[PDB]
Amino acid sequence: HMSYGVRLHVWGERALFTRPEMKVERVSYDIITPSAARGILEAIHWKPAIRWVVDSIQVLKPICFESIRRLSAASISKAIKAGRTDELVKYVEEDRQQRAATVLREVGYIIAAHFEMTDKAGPDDNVGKHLDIFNRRARRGQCFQAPCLGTREFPASFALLGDDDASDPALSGERDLGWMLHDIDFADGMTPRFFRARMVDGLVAVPPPQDGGV
């Protein structure tokens, strides 16, 4: 059993879909990953009975980045000159505490997903019930926890869209966004998988699990 697809407009001032291979600095992927999209639908509603599957992502806004940080050239110079490692250690600890990042700026996507009923489904569980809890909640802007744009420091706004339906020159045509995190192993909820994302007039089809992921 699967639901009809829902459609969820998500956006924010900033986003950070952390690239996993660069495990020192935090850099964002060019667009929301399927796992982060799944993770937003689950924030609105999830239960063991159900499995959210992301089918496609529509990028609404141009891909722009920004260097951001949450003690400078001359201070280093002076503390070395003054022979003060204590201050130099404080400056190092302090720099790490800014947790420098390269984040997406002013984003907005449309997530197209559905859920499938799981083997954890009880007699009281069905598509109708669970689809209606989701829609009621999304319409109302309420959720189990605040959805995020990749990391918890970036809250996700969202509105539910209707059933039906690319004019930005930056988004049109076929574009190869290359390899990116697809989603995490359902099984151990830890070992990541990847797919080559391709974008057509904003639309990025998302392969299912059993496929040329990794």
Beta strands 101-117 and 26-27 are parallel
Nearest 10 degrees: CA dihedral of 28, 41, 44, 40?
Answer: 0
> In one letter, which amino acid is 79?
A
Q: Which residues, 6 or more positions from 57, have their beta carbon under 8 angstroms from its beta carbon? A: 31, 32, 34, 37, 109, 110, 111, 112, 203, 204, 206
Query: What is the experimental method?
Result: X-ray
Segment (H or E) for 134: helix 127-139
Note whether 108 and 11 are within 8 A (CB).
yes
| Phi, psi angles (nearest 5°) of residue 159 | -140, 145
Domain boundaries, given as residue ranges, for the chain:
1-214
Q: Residue 112, SS3?
A: strand
Name 187's bridge partners: none
What fold characterizes domain 1-214? Alpha-Beta Plaits (3.30.70)
